[PDB]
Amino acid sequence: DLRLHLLLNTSVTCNDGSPAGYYLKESRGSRRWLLFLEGGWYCFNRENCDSRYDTMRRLMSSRDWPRTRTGTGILSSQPEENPYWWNANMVFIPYCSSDVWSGASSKSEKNEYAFMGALIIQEVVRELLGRGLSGAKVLLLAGSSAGGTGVLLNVDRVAEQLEKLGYPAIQVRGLADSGWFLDNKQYRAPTEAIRRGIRYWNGVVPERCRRQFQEGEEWNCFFGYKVYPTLRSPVFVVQWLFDEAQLTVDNVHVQEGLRLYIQNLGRELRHTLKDVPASFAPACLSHEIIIRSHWTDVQVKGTSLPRALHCWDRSLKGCPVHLVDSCPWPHCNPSCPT
Ligand SMILES: O=C([O-])COc1ccc(N2C(=O)CCC2=O)cc1
Numbered sequence: 001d002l003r004l005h006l007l008l009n010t011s012v013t014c015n016d017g018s019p020a021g022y023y024l025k026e027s028r029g030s031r032r033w034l035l036f037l038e039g040g041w042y043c044f045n046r047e048n049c050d051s052r053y054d055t056m057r058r059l060m061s062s063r064d065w066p067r068t069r070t071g072t073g074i075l076s077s078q079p080e081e082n083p084y085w086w087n088a089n090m091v092f093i094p095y096c097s098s099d100v101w102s103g104a105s106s107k108s109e110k111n112e113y114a115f116m117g118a119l120i121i122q123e124v125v126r127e128l129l130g131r132g133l134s135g136a137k138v139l140l141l142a143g144s145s146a147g148g149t150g151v152l153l154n155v156d157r158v159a160e161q162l163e164k165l166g167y168p169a170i171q172v173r174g175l176a177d178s179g180w181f182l183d184n185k186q187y188r189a190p191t192e193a194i195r196r197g198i199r200y201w202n203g204v205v206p207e208r209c210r211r212q213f214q215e216g217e218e219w220n221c222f223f224g225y226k227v228y229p230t231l232r233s234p235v236f237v238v239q240w241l242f243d244e245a246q247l248t249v250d251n252v253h254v255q256e257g258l259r260l261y262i263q264n265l266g267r268e269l270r271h272t273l274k275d276v277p278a279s280f281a282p283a284c285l286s287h288e289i290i291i292r293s294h295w296t297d298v299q300v301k302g303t304s305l306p307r308a309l310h311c312w313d314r315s316l317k318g319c320p321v322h323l324v325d326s327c328p329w330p331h332c333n334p335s336c337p338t
């Protein structure tokens with residue numbers, strides 16, 4: 001179990017003004033720290049956020065959070081379930097800001113909701129320094145789905161934070177799971193919903209990316225193949241070639257026209273990963289992987305995801321780090337989740 005701690009700085013809040021927080025289990029012999037960002041879509045205006053508040057309240061408030069969570073997958077402490085970092089200090093950061101971890105706006109007298117995802121990450125890092133993060137050698141910022149996009153948006157800022165707080169020896173890395181999306185044509189739009197949300201949230205993006213696209217176009221930095229080339233921290237990219245959330249925003253739910261659409265989507269995703277040296281991209285129709293119990297089951301070209309992450313650690317013979325399937329249809333890889 002990971003144990004819940006609400007933030008001591010109570011000005012850093014979930015959407016409804018309740019304090020944000022994090023679930024913690026320490027490993028007191030270890031200098032590795034894993035900080036995982038939860039996913040769960042987003043909301044982009046008053047009416048859309050009101051609907052989320054009625055049926056997805058735990059993603060907008062801490063008032064009903066349980067006091068513990070079980071660590072699973074890469075947050076598991078058991079070597080058989082987690083061959084990669086079973087001995088690490090484990091942190092689960094709940095997603096309660098509905099802003100793809102990009103917001104920096106408080107609830108005030110003209111804002112019904114607070115959108116503080118970017119400040120929540122940085123406040124968690126500050127408060128962990130006094131619980132042993134100050135002696136860390138590696139901080140891996142990981143995340144799934146919207147949390148995976150949040151890794152891309154925040155990994156460099158965490159490295160900047162620690163560099164200016166006096167900790168230049170902590171190596172900050174990112175692990176982005178299922179957050180690598182394409183702004184492609186639909187089969188029958190997500191791009192304003194993001195452009196509209198950024199305005200609603202006062203959302204922020206990495207600097208080098210923001211300076212490339214400039215004002216009014218920062219929505220581009222939410223797409224992995226556009227923001228990743230601007231990043232300075234090492235980032236490992238895990239991405240199903242046929243991600244379920246991608247097909248959803250593409251209005252896909254088999255005749256020739258759909259067949260060609262699905263094959264073209266797989267080919268384009270493969271192309272955007274050509275120059276990403278650390279990546280794992282199986283030809284499956286699925287969604288998320290790193291915190292699920294059977295995450296050691298999938299293999300690409302004979303190598304599992306926990307092995308590929310270990311090989312990434314060594315890189316920073318027979319221990320590859322760039323694993324992208326080349327077959328063009330969902331589940332042509334026999335190890336796909338069933
Ligand atoms: O399950 C989940 O959390 C899925 O959430 C998502 C959050 C954001 C996006 N998205 C971007 O980041 C850019 C374009 C786009 O649509 C997609 C899914």
Ligand SMILES: *[C@@H]1O[C@H](CO)[C@@H](O)[C@H](O)[C@H]1NC(C)=O
Pocket residue numbers: 009011012119123
């Ligand atoms: C609490 O968090 C807010 C928002 O990040 C920040 O402005 C403020 O300085 C913090 N307070 C303390 C005491 O660190």
